[PDB]
Structures are given as structure tokens and as C-alpha cells.
Design a binder for this molecule. Structure first.
Ligand SMILES: N[C@H](CCC(=O)N[C@@H](CS)C(=O)NCC(=O)O)C(=O)O
Ligand SMILES: [Zn+2]
Length: 628
């Protein structure tokens, strides 16, 4: 039913073949995968064996009969098929895809059991280790990070999102373990089962000093003991409301439980949607619940990504792009529509910045990607699949008649492809097949531009209300700073209630907008907050309750950015002290850049003080940012 513009692009088979794997995944059905692992903090490496039950698949005549797995920097100790040594070879590593594991399968049967014993290497890319000086708890920690193609560096496997397998796991570890599955009931061997098929990239493992507490009827939180009581409180009141909000929009939650792991303070990343165990950063804990809207993202993934998966990294938008959409649908259901549109607006800025900042936008800003076997999927990561993808789905919601008319397709799509993987073409077909009465409407969508052209997509029209309220107030501050003289003059034009209704994103955007000297392009030429310390100190005093006393990390960061920009020298020490309490790249790295710009000495001293309490990658970058 599709337009020619994209029928010409259509592959011979769908799901489109995944160039980013060296494995011959098309030739097997993975009936089940068993992981038998042992963690060694001593050696900072993971050991054991993986056991696949495979069925050979057949098609056509006179075909090859092979067995190829992916590995990256992995020590493959031995290989058994149906309880017998099978000859094997690790091919010469090539970049960026790794080392093909070729196995000579001497068996007769189309069904067999494949067992591979391995150790991770000191060059393993899948695992992140931290020492006791890098956790507040005092004890060590390890967590996995598999997306996009690092699972092959954790265990030999068919490392493509086109392949999904139920899992079982037995993990042995000195400290407690959590896994991307549901724990079964040695005092320190930990067993799990994932009864819903998953792709390797969604496998999650973590181990360290971990406690657990209920945050709802089907939700438990895991974190360091000291933090447990604060994490319990943060999520208690909203996690279930969130899950039900999502089921009501899409359909029933499938995985049984939704659990959250609040990683150690040195955890440098943002979050990860591992099935049954969502990885989260401690910077959600705001002590006022101002940062939980975020939990919507990884929750949505339960459907977009985990349940219905992109078949390859050319089609990642099907994953993240849908997630942003559903994410925003959930926060819309809870906070209203203007709030959904606010997120959208912001996403649009982020998108424009992303594309303006790329090396090679011509290639990496197209929605559907084209990696072949020689591009590192990580190089194609941008805001594009998130926002350009979201915007297509929003454009579709709009031109098909809104949520009442779109929702039915949402449920059809996720039900159709449940526990399966697809490309962009199967997504369009499904679209067309479901709206035979709207063929007129779909045909008028510029598919070439949306899926395949670089740069910004057709600009949408969002409810700009929440933004305008921020811009108005920041402009008025900038304008007033120029002519008012006294702290009591500022208490006469402003008051704590100016911002009483500002959500987190609004405060963050308010501080960001101030540092940009307002929103009107009719900005003052020579304006510099540093030149108006009466003004700036009054802004912080008057808005002390929601800004200065906020323990939300996103607002704390911006408050600091405004303080350094207003050159309030007495605050530099507080920014410096704070950088020793957070581990996220997002804050730590820019944190030192700010600091360095106003007090290089305090910066260098601060780094020296804290450098060894950070995730190694955060230490290395910051160290070199500071010309060390
Ligand atoms: N065509 C192979 C079957 C493998 C095969 O060579 N089968 C052998 C067993 S060693 C055989 O004896 N087939 C002939 C027969 O059973 O008469 C597949 O399904 O992947
Ligand atoms: Zn995501």
C-alpha cells in the first residue's frame, strides 16, 4: 500500500538484515539462553559459561550450514555442543564489530545445545567497575552497559536486537546481585529467570552492597543501604500511578514486576531500561519528588524497545523515538497537555542544537540510519532518533485526528510486534494497513523528508504556554536589573510567587534563560549579570525556597551556572564542594568547566581533592579538560 518514495528503499526480506553483527543469526531460532557467571572484583572480570539451545532454520536449497557468534575482547576457553568438544576459531578482530567466533558443528540434529566457557578480558567493554573509594557505601561495585553492541564483550552471543531469547541466570558474587530478570528463591549465588524473550543488549547485571524496599504492589527499589530509606520515599507515591497510566494508554504491563536500581554515586550515565531492573542515577532523589517524571522514559521502554524491538541500529528511532512519544503521553496524562507540549518544545531545541553541532549532519541526522558493517553504532547516537522520531509520531497523531484516533493504532502496533523485532518498513505497512480509510491523509506525509533527509523536520506547532511563562519572567528580570538599584526595589517588583507554579523543567529553563540574558532577541548589547550583583543576589534571595533550597540536581546545577555567570565569588566554594557529591558526567564535567572559568586555582584544587572518587572515565576527561 506504500508510496514509491519508500517502496524503492524496501529490502528483499524484513526485518532488514543487521550489518552490525558478524553472527549468522538468520539461521537459528534461539529457544533459550542460560548464563552461568561468577564475579571477581579481585580481577575485575566476569567468568563462566553461556548455554544456548538452538534450532537450525532452513530455507531454499543447497545452503551453507554454519555457526557464527559475536565476541569483542573475550577469552573463549572452550566449546561444547551436545556435551562434546567442538573445534573452534576466533577470527582476527576487525573494527568496529569485533571478533567472529566460528564453531565447527559436527552434529546431525537441527536442535542442539551450545555451551561456551569464557572469561571477560581487561579490555572488556561491557562492564564498569568501581573501587571502594568511588562509592559512598564503602564497598566496591560493578554494573553492565550493553547497548548497543557490547553484549558480545560480556559473553559470546548473537549480538543483534533481531534476536530475542528467554533467559535464565546463576550469578555468584561476594556482594548481592541484581539482573535484568526475576529473582528465584550457596548463600551468595543468585538465580534469575526472564520469561519474556529479550535481546542481548538489554541484559543487565549489577553487584555491590545492595538493599531492597517496596515502592509499590509490583515494584521494589534496590540501592546502597544508607540511601535505601530516601529512595523508598521518592518512588513510593508515584511508581504505580505511572505504570497504570502507561497501561491505560497502551496495554497491560507484561513483565510482572517493575523494579528500579539506584546505582552508586559515581555512576556517570543517565539511565538504562533493562527489563525487570531499570538502572537509574542517584540524582533522581530530589527529596521533594520533583525529578520522577523522568522514570516515565525507562518505563515506556517496557513497550517501545523491550517488548517491540528495532531489528538493527539503522532503525533505532522505532525504539527511542516511540519511547519519547509514550513518555510524553504519560506525563501529559498526569500533568495535562500543556506540560506534554512543554517537554516537546524543549526537545525541539535540543534537536536543533544536536543537528547544528554534528560532524557530518548530512549522514547522522537522517531518521533512518545506514551503518553497514563498518560504522560504530555509538557514532550514530544523537538527539535525532529521540526527537525527529518523536516528532513524526506527533505529526501522525495530529493529522490522523488526535489521541482518540491514534491510540487504537498504538495498541495494534505493540500487540502485533510483541516479543518480536521490526524495521521501519514493517512499521509503515502496519500504519497503512490499519488506516485504509486515511490513505489520503498518510499519502500527504512527506516520507522522504521525514525518514531519509537530514536536518530539521517540518516544524510543528506546540502549546508554548509553560515556556512563555518562563521567558516572560526572565526577560522582566534582565530588564529590571538595568534600572532598579536596591534589594528592596527588587522585592517590590518580584516575589516568591512568580515561580510558585514552576515545574522542574521550568525552573531549569528559567535559570538557563537568565544566563543567556533573556529570551527576546532584543537583548541588551553590553548586558552581563556580573555587572549587577544587587540584582542577581536578590533573584536568589527572593526565589530562595524553590531554587536555592532545591535539592533537585538539575536545578542545583543551573543555580550554580547562574551564580558563576553572575560572578558571585562567594558561591564558587559551594559549587566546588558540590562537585564532590555527584558522579554524573552531565553535572561533573560541565561543573569543572564553569568553575575553571572563574577560579582556576579552586578548580585544580577541587579536582585534586576528588579525582579518585569518580568513575575513571569522568576523571580522565575532566583531568584533560583542565589541561592536566
Ligand atoms: N540438512 C541438515 C540435516 C543434517 C544432516 O546431514 N543429517 C544427516 C545426519 S548426520 C543425515 O544422515 N541425513 C540423511 C538421512 O537422515 O537419511 C539440516 O537440517 O540442517
Ligand atoms: Zn531510552
Amino acid at each position: 500500500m506504500l508510496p514509491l518514495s519508500i517502496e524503492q528503499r524496501r529490502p528483499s526480506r524484513s526485518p532488514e538484515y543487521d550489518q552490525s553483527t558478524l553472527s549468522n543469526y538468520k539461521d537459528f531460532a534461539v529457544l533459550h539462553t542460560d548464563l552461568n557467571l561468577s564475579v571477581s572484583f579481585e580481577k575485575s572480570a566476569i567468568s563462566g559459561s553461556v548455554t544456548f539451545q538452538l534450532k537450525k532454520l532452513h530455507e531454499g536449497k543447497n545452503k551453507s550450514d554454519e555457526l557464527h557468534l559475536d565476541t569483542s575482547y573475550l577469552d573463549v576457553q572452550e566449546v561444547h555442543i551436545d556435551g562434546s568438544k567442538a573445534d573452534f576459531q576466533i577470527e582476527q578482530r576487525k573494527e568496529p564489530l569485533g571478533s567472529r567466533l566460528v564453531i565447527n558443528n559436527a552434529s546431525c540434529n537441527d536442535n542442539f545445545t551450545l555451551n561456551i566457557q569464557f572469561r571477560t578480558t581487561d579490555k572488556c567493554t561491557a562492564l564498569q567497575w568501581l573501587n571502594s573509594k568511588q562509592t559512598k557505601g564503602g564497598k566496591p561495585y560493578v554494573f553492565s552497559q550493553l547497548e548497543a553492541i557490547h553484549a558480545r564483550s560480556l559473553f559470546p552471543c548473537f549480538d543483534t536486537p533481531s534476536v530475542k531469547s528467554t533467559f535464565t541466570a546463576s550469578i555468584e558474587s561476594p556482594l548481592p546481585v541484581v539482573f535484568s530478570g526475576i529473582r528465584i528463591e550457596d548463600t551468595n549465588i543468585y538465580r534469575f529467570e526472564q520469561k519474556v524473550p529479550i535481546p542481548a543488549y538489554l541484559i543487565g547485571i549489577a553487584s555491590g552492597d545492595l538493599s531492597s524496599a517496596p515502592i509499590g504492589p509490583r515494584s521494589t527499589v534496590y540501592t546502597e543501604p544508607f540511601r535505601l530509606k530516601d529512595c523508598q520515599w521518592e518512588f513510593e507515591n508515584d511508581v504505580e500511578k505511572f505504570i497504570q497510566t502507561a497501561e491505560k494508554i497502551i496495554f497491560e504491563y507484561e513483565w510482572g514486576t517493575y523494579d528500579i536500581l539506584v546505582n552508586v554515586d559515581s555512576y556517570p550515565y543517565g539511565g538504562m531500561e533493562s527489563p525487570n531492573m531499570t538502572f537509574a542515577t542517584p540524582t533522581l532523589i530530589a527529596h521533594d519528588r520533583s525529578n520522577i517524571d523522568v522514570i516515565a522514559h525507562e518505563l515506556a521502554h517496557s513497550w517501545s524497545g523491550n517488548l517491540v524491538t528495532n531489528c538493527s541500529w539503522n532503525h533505532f528511532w522505532l525504539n527511542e523515538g516511540w519511547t519519547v512519544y509514550l513518555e510524553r503521553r504519560i506525563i501529559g496524562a498526569i500533568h495535562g497537555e500543556p506540560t506534554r507540549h512543554f517537554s516537546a518544545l524543549i526537545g525541539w531545541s535540543d534537536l536543533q542544537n544536536s543537528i547544528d553541532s554534528m560532524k557530518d549532519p548530512e549522514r547522522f541526522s537522517t531518521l533512518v540510519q545506514n551503518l553497514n558493517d563498518n560504522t560504530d553504532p555509538d557514532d550514530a547516537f544523537s538527539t535525532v532518533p529521540y526527537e525527529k522520531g518523536f516528532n513524526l509520531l506527533f505529526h501522525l497523531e495530529t493529522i490522523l485526528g488526535g489521541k482518540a484516533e491514534f491510540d487504537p493504532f498504538i495498541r495494534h502496533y505493540f500487540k502485533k510486534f510483541a516479543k518480536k523485532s521490526l524495521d521501519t518498513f514493517q512499521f509503515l505497512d502496519t500504519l497503512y494497513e490499519f488506516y485504509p480509510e486515511k490513505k489520503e491523509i498518510l499519502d500527504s506525509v512527506d516520507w522522504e523528508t521525514w525518514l531519509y533527509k537530514p536536518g530539521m523536520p517540518p516544524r510543528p506547532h506546540f502549546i508554548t504556554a509553560l515556556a512563555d511563562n518562563v521567558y516572560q519572567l526572565a526577560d522582566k528580570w534582565v530588564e529590571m536589573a538595568q534600572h532598579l538599584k536596591t534589594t528592596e526595589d527588587f522585592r517590590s517588583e518580584f516575589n516568591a510567587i512568580d515561580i510558585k507554579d514552576f515545574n522542574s523543567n521550568q525552573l531549569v529553563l528559567f535559570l538557563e534563560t537568565l544566563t543567556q540574558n533573556g529570551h527576546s532577541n532584543k537583548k541588551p548589547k553590553d548586558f552581563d549579570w556580573a555587572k549587577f550583583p544587587v540584582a542577581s543576589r536578590a533573584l536568589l534571595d527572593i526565589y530562595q525556597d524553590n531554587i536555592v533550597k532545591s535539592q533537585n540536581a538539575e536545578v542545583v546545577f543551573k543555580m550554580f551556572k547562574f551564580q558563576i555567570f553572575a560572578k558571585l565569588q562567594e558561591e564558587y566554594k559551594h559549587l566546588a564542594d558540590w562537585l564532590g557529591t555527584v558522579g554524573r558526567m552531565k553535572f561533573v564535567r560541565p561543573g569543572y568547566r564553569l568553575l575553571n572559568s572563574v577560579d582556576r586555582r579552586l578548580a585544580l584544587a577541587t579536582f585534586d581533592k576528588f579525582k579518585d572518587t569518580y568513575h575513571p572515565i569522568c576523571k580522565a576527561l575532566v583531568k584533560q579538560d583542565l589541561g592536566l
